[PDB]
Amino acid sequence: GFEGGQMPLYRRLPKFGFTSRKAAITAEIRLSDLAKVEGGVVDLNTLKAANIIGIQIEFAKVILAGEVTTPVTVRGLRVTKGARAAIEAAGGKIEE
Amino acid sequence: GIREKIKLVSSAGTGHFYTTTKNKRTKPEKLELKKFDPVVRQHVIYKEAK
């Protein structure tokens, strides 16, 4: 990033934002998993135990990203709208 | 040049201000303009020629 002496692009443009601290401990669970949890019950542990979120993770969310089949009981995780419909449509149960 | 910068503050409870420039010397009177307040969403009187 040296343009001759002209003020470089990364230094003539302003800086924005901040880093959250909390987005580093949120996660994002698909529906392709949660057939992988060994139990048919989904909490933060039961996902950590299945090597699927990570140990530092405190918050998780159950995004519609494809094809849940078995009846799964989701516990204590936020679930999106479309994926609430997809978990409840394929048997399933969501309590919080 | 000589022409200063002022804040037209809103007469409603908001902090919203327009900003502009006034010749302080020739027009020492305050400047009242019924401008638009987007927090109230209504045309309110604005005051404060700084």
């Binding site: 990033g1 692009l9 003539r12 302003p14 800086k15 924005f16 934002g17 | 420039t21």
Partner: protein, 64 residues
């Protein structure tokens, strides 16, 4: 070694969904009462880094 990020570039560009980089527009920090509101309103949303400059940005940001 491991490649160091040009650190003040990470504060200014952010990666998008298809590899492009977004950035905040210049010219909207101070001297502002002289500018039309049409300028300022068109400088608030964030913008993509153009074709010319992606080389530089990718060089400065090798992990993002």
């Amino acid at each position: 070694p491991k490649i160091k990020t040009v650190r003040g570039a990470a504060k200014r560009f952010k990666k998008t969904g298809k590899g492009g980089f977004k950035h905040k527009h210049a010219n909207l920090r101070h001297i502002l009462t002289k500018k039309a509101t049409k300028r300022k309103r068109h400088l608030r949303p964030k913008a993509m880094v153009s074709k010319g400059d992606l080389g530089l940005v990718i060089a400065c940001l090798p992990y993002a």
